[PDB]
Each structure stands twice: as structure tokens, then as C-alpha cells.
Task: inverse folding
């Protein structure tokens, strides 16, 4: 058996989360279901894709990453197993774990059954037709070592998360027309550092970089 | 035991939901980030999930007389009509006034005591739900009262053609009381004529929703905002 | 095995919250209950109170994991404290009010293998493993405390606010029929906030045993321009 990590964008405002749990319990009672049903932000694919990118490494290999959110539904197999919409949500996750195989799942009710099936270890070919992994939809996002990148999204504190994979110590980064020093240790001035997800982040000591620097999603970020 | 499904308007900023869960453990969440005091929104949420829940489950819902009503499913919450729609799917046979023993705080400063009647979810509903979840008799909760005395909101689902806006979802979609959405037809609400459709592909559209009620949405938008809709607004099938 | 109650100001949508839950679920594992994650960013007083509100009702021995760390990227200890309940979080005074109810018997410095030390520590304690394995033991008196004190009065202060704007004070008493002064104005103390006209100021003993100030059907915080730290006094 393999555990099911249930991710969704309910924000504790949609009772459907309980229906999904009921379906998983009825079709595959054995497998554990880790409730992360409110971990994804709704109507913000870039931020949702980033959230998965940061969390994925902490999930046990082989776990069924279930994302309940017109777009076809798919299952993808890599180090981890994925079940969700083929709308680019898993774009960043797949950079860490390029899927080896993918399958078409033949509304919102399509996901749980597929996840249960895979959780029980039943053959994927049973979910539906196999499709080439190259046909899996991807957001036009790229994580680079620089020097040019962009503001991917922001966190609740206003810190800006970028697409840059390197934060040269003693170096400087340009964003919002401001030149920010790259350090580690953090005064309402900005600072850049390699964040928890391995991506360069920009923060304002005790403040909001987003608001203080008037930053916007999609803005350019340049390592100097 | 019987599982406990929990719904409230407690929000995500306070530890109220957790405290109720703690008392219960002395639990599956339905929803907690619902608009405060919004009974219609809460009534619909229960309606939406009830049919998929295990028979005999205890539905604890706190959104504002404290009662417990028994049907195929068990209900615990305020007698303010919150359970109106759920009861259309499962009309209670018996109801009881809740007078369970108040939970005892484990830590307490000298002569310290919490305010009286300041957190019913914790001191009245939670102990009642635990009692029922354990399988203990309902009469052990308090005096029995006639189900006919239970409160209900003035919500009527209907084939139409006249209905009303029941509530809105988190995206601003309007949920109506209409049970049918004629193919190729039109629905009038807020002075606008909205086309009814099955497949989609800033524009408003009507369709039969996941709970069997006609809904009005705006592609990548808020029907509530964009169309200036409000609860109670009449909806008419043209 | 003990349950884990998790509090923070990151917001439910922050992946850090998912990571912690994944680390804690890394069968059998502890039940994980969220206290709250949408607390106002960096608001230690509000968080401290939330812990105070919930503590008396949590299972004895529960692990309280609270991560409100405004001291991000600064010198501050990460610690675990053991009492009737167990605490894991930054040594920034966040647990001040909880410790008034439950004075820690032991404290440990969480050594790194940095908030990435919190989840692992919580899991270690939830499983009932030796606290010695977390890092070096330290004196409990050295634990940081916020400059807060719950008092009998008559002088107190506005501690924090709830979502509706009700002001939570540090006063442990709310004598009905009496009066409390806040901002120079006399506010009546009643059994409940409804015993006054809509829009009128009123004081009462809250759900956590502290005197609260509200505006019936309104927001005391906004309507009265209240601020944390503001002097309050029983008349």
C-alpha cells in the first residue's frame, strides 16, 4: 500500500473535501490519507505549482500526490505518483521528478477513484489509455541559475519568491528597480537569500517586500 | 463509534475549531471558513455534503436554543434553521434540548473561570456531539422536544419557473433554489437574461450545479460582483 | 504517542504548513490538529493569547507546536519546553501565557542537523522519545517571556484583539455592574455583550477568563480606536 497525500484548494470553504475523504475511505480503506486539502491557493496556478515544488521533497517516495481542483484528468508516474488536472499544476514538481509514464483518467469526482486505485497498488493501465509524458501540459515557467529570472509569486509576509536557483553570497540582485544585497542573516531594508525551496527570495527586514518595493508577480529579477 | 462531521463559521484566525476537536477527543471537517452568521451559506454546505456521509454520522454545525435532532443522520447545533436543507433530505424524528455537563479546563489560575455562555461550541455542542458519537442515548442530553417546534428558514426548492438566489459560493457563483435548468433556455436574475448551458467554452452562464440546483457563474469572475447579485433576489426561468 | 496541535502565522496555503504535516506523518503517527495558521503576521501577543485560550482543553501531554517567528533570520533560540503539556517553538515569548498556566519543568535547545528544526522536534516528542535527543538541556528560567502579566487589577492593558475587533485585556476580573476605564472613557461591565444597545461599548468576562471590551454588533478596536498595550483600569 502507498499513502495518499490529498492536496486541494478548498480553503476550508468547500465541504467537498469530506466527500473526497469518504470516497477514498470506501474504495481504499487501507491506505493512509494525509489531509493537505487546503494547502493550494485557488485561482493562482503559479503559486499552487510553487507550493507543490516546496512540499514534494518531504513526501515519501511512491506516495500518491492527489490534487483535486475544460481540462483532461491524468495520472503520472515518477519517483512519486500524481493524480490531478492536466493544467500545469504539477509543472514545477515534474522538474524535480520528470514523469516516466502518464495515463488519461476516463468532473471533480474522477480524481479520488484513481488515487485509491493507485494507492492499493493496482496496475495504472487500468486507469485508462497511456499517453506520452511529453503531452502533459506545462506552465511556461522555468527555474534557472540566472542571471535573469522573474518574481514567481509571494508569500503571506510579502516576501517575493523568484525563479532563480542561485543566490551568490556577497552578490546583488535587481528587482523593482532596487538593488538588493544577497545575504543569509537579516531595519526596513530589503535582502535576498536562497529560500526554503531552493529558490532565491526577496524580503524586507520586518516588513513586506511586495508592498515596500511595490513588487508585482511576473516582474524581472536580475543577478548582478 | 460514529464519525463526527464538523462545520462552523469560526474562521481560520482563532483556535476555536481546534478547541472543539480537543473536547471531542476528551472528526472530519466540512467547512470552517464560512462567512460569519451566514446561515443560508451554511445550510447549503450541509445540503451539499450530507448524502455522501456515512449513515448515523453526527453532524456538528455551529453557526449563529441548542438542540440535537435525530434522523438517518444525527444533527447537533443551534435551533435557528441552519439544518433546514439537510432536513429536506432527512427529516428528524426526534429532537432534544442540550444540557450536557460543561467540559472541565485542565489548567486554571487561582480562582480563574471562563465566562458563562461565551463559547457554546466548546461548552454545549462539543460535549453533546461526543456523547452521541460514543453511542450514548439522546435522552441523556436533555429534555426531549417536539420536532415540529424546530426552526426552519423560508427556503423552498422548486422546479420553478420562479425561484430565488439562495446563497453564493467562494467564487461568487450564485446558488439558486431552482431544481431545473432547461437546455438552451434563459434564466432572468438581477434584470439580466442569462443563457443556460451544459458545457463551457467575464460572461455569465447558468447551469445545473453539483448539488442539483441551478447556478449562475461568470467565467473567471464573480457573478456576485460582476452582476451585483444578492441573496433573496428572484430568479425566473424564461 | 501524543497528539500534535499546530499554530502559526504562515497561512494555510503556505507550503511550510504542508511540509510540517508531511514531516509529522513520516504509521503509527500522531494526530495533527491545526490550532490556527491565519494569525496576523508576526503578532506574538495574538498568538500567545490563542495558545492561552486553547491550552486548558488540550489532552494532557499534547505537543504544542507554535511557529510565529518574526525573528526570521535573526539570532534567537529554537526550543522545546516540557510541563503538563509540551511546547516546541521559537524562544521569543510566544508561549508566555501558556507558561503562566503551565510553568515549564525542563527546556531544551533545538540543535540544527532555522525553522526546519521545529517539525522534527515535534515528531520526536509526539513519539515519546527522550527529550535529551533534541539537543542540550537549558535552564527554564532563561526562556524568553513577553512583557505581559495577567492581573487582578485594577490596572491592566489591552492584550490583543479577535477577528471582530473585541479587545482582549490582561484583567482576570470583570465585576458585573462595575465599570472599566479605557482611553479615558467609562465602559460598563455586564454579564454579556448583548446587555447593551447596538453600537454601545460593553465589558464582560470572555471565554478565556479575561475581561474583554466590545461594541455590541460592532468593532471596539475600530470604533474606539483601541491599540495593543493601551492602559485599562477597573473603577
Result:
Amino acid at each position: 500500500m502507498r499513502p495518499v497525500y490529498f492536496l486541494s484548494d478548498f480553503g476550508l470553504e468547500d465541504p467537498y473535501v469530506a466527500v473526497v475523504k469518504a470516497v477514498l475511505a470506501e474504495r481504499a480503506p487501507g491506505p493512509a490519507v494525509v489531509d493537505l486539502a487546503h494547502a493550494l491557493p485557488p485561482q493562482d496556478l503559479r503559486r499552487a505549482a510553487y507550493a507543490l515544488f516546496e512540499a514534494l521533497p518531504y513526501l515519501p517516495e511512491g506516495a500518491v500526490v492527489l490534487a483535486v481542483v475544460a481540462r483532461r484528468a491524468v495520472a503520472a508516474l515518477g519517483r512519486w505518483t500524481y493524480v490531478g488536472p492536466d493544467n500545469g499544476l504539477f509543472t514545477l514538481a515534474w522538474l524535480l521528478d520528470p514523469p516516466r509514464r502518464a495515463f488519461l483518467l476516463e468532473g471533480r469526482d474522477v480524481f479520488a477513484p484513481a488515487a485509491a486505485h493507485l494507492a492499493l497498488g493496482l496496475p495504472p493501465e487500468g486507469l485508462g489509455p497511456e499517453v506520452p509524458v511529453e503531452t502533459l501540459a506545462r506552465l511556461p515557467l522555468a527555474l534557472t541559475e540566472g542571471p535573469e529570472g522573474e518574481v514567481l509569486t509571494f508569500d503571506r509576509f510579502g516576501n517575493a519568491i523568484t525563479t532563480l536557483l542561485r543566490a551568490p553570497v556577497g552578490g546583488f540582485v535587481e528587482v523593482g528597480g532596487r538593488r538588493v544585497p544577497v545575504r543569509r542573516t537579516f531595519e526596513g531594508a530589503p535582502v535576498a537569500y536562497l529560500g526554503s525551496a531552493g529558490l532565491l527570495e526577496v524580503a524586507v527586514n520586518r516588513g513586506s517586500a511586495r508592498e515596500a518595493l511595490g513588487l508585482k508577480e511576473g516582474m524581472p529579477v536580475r543577478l548582478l
Remarks:
- The longest helix of chain C spans residues 44-54.
- Helices of chain C lie at 15-24, 44-54, 96-101, 118-126, 220-223.
